[PDB]
Amino acid sequence: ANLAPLPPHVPEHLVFDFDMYNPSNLSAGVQEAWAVLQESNVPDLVWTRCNGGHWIATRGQLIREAYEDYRHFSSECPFIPREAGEAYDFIPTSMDPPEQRQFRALANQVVGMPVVDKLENRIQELACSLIESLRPQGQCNFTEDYAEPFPIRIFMLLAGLPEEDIPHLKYLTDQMTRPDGSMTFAEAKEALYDYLIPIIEQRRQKPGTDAISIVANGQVNGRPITSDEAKRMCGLLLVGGLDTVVNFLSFSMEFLAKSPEHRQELIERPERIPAACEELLRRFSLVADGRILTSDYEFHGVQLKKGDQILLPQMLSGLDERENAAPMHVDFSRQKVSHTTFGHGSHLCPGQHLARREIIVTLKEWLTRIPDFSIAPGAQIQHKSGIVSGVQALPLVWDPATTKAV
């Protein structure tokens, strides 16, 4: 197929042609498809000839180790394929410490817990409002009726952007994580940057309370942040707010719709919701990006070459049986829930608190009003793989009579 010729320094015995954008066992579930990389005879570190050719760490131990060693594993070129990785200049993700820190502080300021607290009521209100509106219908296309609008509307509120632009922005964001082939990562990035620039210059004048104004008026390296730097950071924020929680919610709801027993557990023991959120985050982890070698380096007996790209699937750590016994089994009472769903190292997701709030509010408010629901009859759920994996569609059904209003 589209396999790049094996490079001279890469041993043939370490070859495993995994395609992160279309894994072979996708029909069994995306997490299950990636899990093949953790089967008995698969090395801890393999090389796939797919997507231009790149390494793939398959165990949590290596993934964590690599994300900690930024001196060897630089985030300068974090995306596969290389062309996308080279065009990827988002801030602060494309930067390594010490350079990353000043920009990371600003990014954290606009999506951190203090912001979540400020938005507590908006988040709560939107969830209840959306659910109450769907409740009497007895059915919904979950991905588009809730998974997308709930977190996206909250983010647009946070960023101070008009909801009218959602279709446009969500489309561009997806092209950077799960390209449909209509455009390159670079074209999508430039389109998003072009959307943001006029807004940034517009707000760079007066101090605002929205994320874009705060970024545009930030101070980094003892100077005002430039409009271009603000652009590089805001683009990252847009992608982070429009294509992460959105997909995770669908993996979680798909699971709940297929498991009455787990729905009942949370209905009867609501105090377990926080823990359930964490276990779902482990089992349905969905991100996978990587790093690039800054110099020749021997890692776990494997000769990595400067310029080599290495995928470090955040998704795989928690599915690693070496980290969690019976990894594919969802156990809300699981002891020592281990995962790197939000990343590891200096780039550990600063938006994870907003994410957990949206997930926990969804679990609480959905089960409170629509405790009983199932996958539409005859429906077969399809997943999609990429930098961020997702659910193509999730048709749900329920008897309106069983629903409750608050």
Ligand X SMILES: CC1(C)[C@@H]2CC[C@@]1(C)C(=O)C2
Nearest alpha-carbon partner for 92 in 220, 184, 245: 220
The reply on whether position 47 binds K ion by CB under 5 A is no
Kind and range of the H or E run holding 8: none
Of 272 and 356, nearer to ligand X (C-beta) is 356
Selected range binding K ion among 86-94, 256-264, 299-307, 368-376, rule: CB under 5 A:
86-94
The reply on whether position 244 binds ligand X by CB under 6 A is yes
Kind and range of the H or E run holding 223: strand 223-224
The amino acid that residue 331 corresponds to is D
> What span, in angstroms and rounded, lies between the C-alpha atoms of 317 and 272?
23
**Sign of torsion, CA 288 353 173 214?**
negative
Contact between 323 and 86 under an 8 Å Cβ cutoff? The reply is: no
Contact between 315 and 327 under an 8 Å Cβ cutoff? The reply is: no
The reply on whether position 289 binds ligand X by CB under 6 A is yes
Least Å from the CB of residue 306 to K ion? 15
Selected range binding K ion among 54-62, 80-88, 158-166, 192-200, rule: CB under 5 A:
80-88
* Bridge partners of residue 223, in order along the sequence: 220
231, interface contact from K ion, ligand HEM, ligand X, none, CB < 5-8 Å by kind: none
The reply on whether position 239 binds ligand X by CB under 6 A is yes
Least Å from the CB of residue 351 to ligand X? 8
> What span, in angstroms and rounded, lies between the C-alpha atoms of 381 and 29?
9
> What span, in angstroms and rounded, lies between the C-alpha atoms of 66 and 26?
26
Give the x/- contact pattern for ligand X in 196-235, rule: CB under 6 A: ----------------------------------------
The reply on whether position 88 binds K ion by CB under 5 A is yes
| Annotated binding-site positions | 349
The reply on whether position 240 binds ligand X by CB under 6 A is yes
Least Å from the CB of residue 387 to ligand X? 5
- What tokens appear for 91 in the block? 């801030």
Size (the chain), residues: 406
Of 145 and 289, nearer to ligand HEM (C-beta) is 289
Of 53 and 78, nearer to ligand HEM (C-beta) is 78
Residues numbered 325-354 forming contacts with ligand X, rule: CB under 6 A: none
Which of residues 199, 245, 287, 304 is near ligand X by CB under 6 A? 287
Least Å from the CB of residue 80 to ligand HEM? 12
Which of residues 31, 48, 175, 177 is near ligand X by CB under 6 A? 177
Which residues are CB-neighbours of 255 under 8 A, at least 6 positions away? Answer: 262, 280, 283, 284, 330
* Bridge partners of residue 190, in order along the sequence: none
Of 68 and 125, nearer to ligand HEM (C-beta) is 68
| Annotated binding-site positions for heme | 349
Number of residues that bind ligand X (CB under 6 A): 10
Least Å from the CB of residue 320 to K ion? 27
Of 140 and 388, nearer to ligand X (C-beta) is 388
Selected range binding ligand X among 54-62, 107-115, 238-246, 266-274, rule: CB under 6 A:
238-246
Selected range binding K ion among 22-30, 87-95, 152-160, 392-400, rule: CB under 5 A:
87-95
Least Å from the CB of residue 181 to ligand X? 18
Nearest alpha-carbon partner for 88 in 291, 279, 343: 291
- Measured CA distances, 176 to 83, 191, 253 (Å): 12, 11, 24
> What span, in angstroms and rounded, lies between the C-alpha atoms of 333 and 323?
16
Which residues are CB-neighbours of 17 under 8 A, at least 6 positions away? Answer: 3, 48, 49, 50
To the nearest 10 degrees (0 to 180), the angle between helices 166-177 and 227-242 is: 90
Binding site for K ion (CB under 5 A): 6, 10, 77, 88
Binding site for ligand X (CB under 6 A): 90, 93, 177, 239-240, 244, 287, 289, 387-388
